[PDB]
Symmetry: D3
Subunit: 162 residues, 6 copies
Amino acid sequence: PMKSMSESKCYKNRQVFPQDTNHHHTMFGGTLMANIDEIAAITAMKHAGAQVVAASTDSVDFLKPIKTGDILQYVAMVSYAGTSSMEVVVQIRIDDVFNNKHDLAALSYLTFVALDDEGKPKHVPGVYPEDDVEKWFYDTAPQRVERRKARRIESKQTIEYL
Amino acid sequence: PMKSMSESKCYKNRQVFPQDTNHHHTMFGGTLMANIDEIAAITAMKHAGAQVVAASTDSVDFLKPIKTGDILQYVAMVSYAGTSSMEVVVQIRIDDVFNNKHDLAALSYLTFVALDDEGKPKHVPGVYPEDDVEKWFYDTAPQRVERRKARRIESKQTIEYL
Amino acid sequence: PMKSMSESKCYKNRQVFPQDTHTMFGGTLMANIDEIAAITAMKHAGAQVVAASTDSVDFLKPIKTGDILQYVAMVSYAGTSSMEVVVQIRIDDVFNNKHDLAALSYLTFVALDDEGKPKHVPGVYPEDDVEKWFYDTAPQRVERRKARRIESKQTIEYL
Amino acid sequence: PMKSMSESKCYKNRQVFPQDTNHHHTMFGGTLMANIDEIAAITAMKHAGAQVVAASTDSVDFLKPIKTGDILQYVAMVSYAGTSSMEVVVQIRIDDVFNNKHDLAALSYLTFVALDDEGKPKHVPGVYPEDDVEKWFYDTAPQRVERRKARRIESKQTIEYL
Amino acid sequence: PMKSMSESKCYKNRQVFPQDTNHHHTMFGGTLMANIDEIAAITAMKHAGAQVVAASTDSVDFLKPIKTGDILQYVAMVSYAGTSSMEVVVQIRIDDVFNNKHDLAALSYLTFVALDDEGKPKHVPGVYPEDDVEKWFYDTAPQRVERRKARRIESKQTIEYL
Amino acid sequence: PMKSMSESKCYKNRQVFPQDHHTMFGGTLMANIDEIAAITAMKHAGAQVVAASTDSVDFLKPIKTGDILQYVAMVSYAGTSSMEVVVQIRIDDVFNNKHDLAALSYLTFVALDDEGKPKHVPGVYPEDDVEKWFYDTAPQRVERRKARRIESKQTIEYL
């Protein structure tokens, strides 16, 4: 079974308010990350057709500053599907509604694991791209997914050490 | 100029409440990340002696599930100091308070840039470990820092592509 | 100048939890409705907007803890400076891929120039049969809107 | 069995804080609607002496902008009591304490249904006005109510079509 | 110049939500204290007819537990007025709205100072009771007020020592 | 059985932001005070705890936006089942590495068993010159607390 990256794509438009920003008109990194986590989890469930858990936030790159009164569009897709696990890619765009352009302000990758009711890993469908943006994330996923497994084993050492 | 990892170490004790969990009694990943972001930024400022910006969240590994009513301890330290940049390591512990135990539930690494009154990169002091845990993060930090730089190469290639 | 109902269409997916309740509390739903409708109206007007009124929120099916919500907002009517936004709130069944309409809301926004004055907005046109259903039923709702702000007019006068 | 509009009257003074406003320092239509819904539900419970559920928000009219640091006074009353259903009216006042004035900033009408311990519609006492303002909302209620029942017919036609 | 205790009396009905309670379904002391502080300031502004600042929360006594879904009624009054300062008393009641009983669940006393538009202390009117509840708090204020002036001497000793 | 004031000492660093004339809202400060103190009391008692009272919160220096706050909570007194927790709220100047005491609070917690009845707690002892200042002065605050609990129950009696 295969699902396109589009089938489980989730959208979220949100505006940046003063309670969401810092001391320099600039969005709290923590607030961006919470929203990222929220949209990615739903995208992961839709795709898996099962409850999911976050194994890890593999990265969040802050690329362009986000200020109060800015309009955000979050886009989430499954970019890699292993046995029970998926990489979700989230794009966070600054949406200019007065000259109708979009700039990529942050980029994030997350790893979710699907669970049955047992609490055990559930097989998930595979995923496939349909346009080239989807293909870009799809093609680059395998080098990211192995680095994820490598850094979780150096994370294995660290817990053992402590 | 040099600072110990301890000089700028920040602590945060917080309890896990219903408002913070999902309907499986498990802590929202986004909430953990907002708190991680908050504690790490303060640690980064203390150390830099200047305002700072988040360049990136390099990873969050969720290692043990966190449930409602659990007591958390966040510990943040600067584990690497470059020219203008800091890696902050944040440890999130589940604190067993009548068996006085601590289990490592999540581990995160973040990157900050110090800024002058203008908004341009500012020199930061170097950092040094004093105990063997501090030395562990310090010693393993350089292998992590190159991966950080290699992988934002992928992010601009990705921005370029889009 | 015209925009389709799709051009300014905004989406929001949300899961329902306890801080959100096993019936979802209305206040939470109404904050999310207002948030999504305003962004759709800005996108359409290409200008700052203000909420003139919430014309209705209909609670049709209860929303329970752990339900997954999908909000869809569209401009269903554009007069001179004012837009009607319709928000559909769906209970999104993701393991059997069903959708049930749980709540329905209609709001009225006015576009503003930099002054603080009403700004002309482009028109709107439907492209599919759902968009047409809301587009076609909008005109009775819109004067019912101005009809009750004349009744709102008497009320403030009296008080 | 009958109750005056005053018997179930609820009050709420609240100040408007940044957490409640957008970047024009203007109160969120959504926050206001949550507060209206909260005060109306309690007034509806008091009148019916039963748990209640919201069938609808019949209207909210935004009449004067509400700004940060403004002091609000909410007043909720039952303006109509049918068999199992109640109309609640909420007046939202900007409360000026330096000259002791009140200006009407928003007006809302909501519809609640009283429920059995089973969850089936429960009979409510009737309601009666005692002054000229209460009589004004009372005399104007039946027209709003007939519109309410009409608007749920169009709500079902919409559902059928979808 | 004098005001009765009733002139500046503020009311607030609020229901207790999950967001307000802990993992034992029990209201956050911090939330109650925030709500207490909010209503008292307004009562203080009303009495003084000027901006106010909180000098202290003189005590909050938790007398009966407050749970999720409970309905609270807060009542705030000026119980004492010195030259520039006011004591506000807040009663927090659990409101049984189907048997119309009230239990006093918490009791708090706060002290505000009225300020002029510059930011210096402003004189406030005197205060007087009209019923037996109002006279109860008025008559017992002198000991609370002396408890208050003593405790800011000890607060100064503490600062000097630190 | 005894624990030092340090064994259960808790820390919390926070910055003062929008959601928080920008002069920090007392309610935000008091919410944070209550949270940090309850955790210190559990740590000390090694048991679930309830807040009996907030004995005082003194606002000593205004806290304005961009201040960095450091909260420190300690057990300053331990009776049979009850604890006084002292919370220090500091304005932490981080580029001059100095500290100002902005607010000071004392709270009273009672320890509870799984039954829900008062649980005995270990005693407390100071180790440094600051800990001894709070320790030595606690009994007069503590008696002032036991008197105010009577006046509060009597108040209930009267109403």
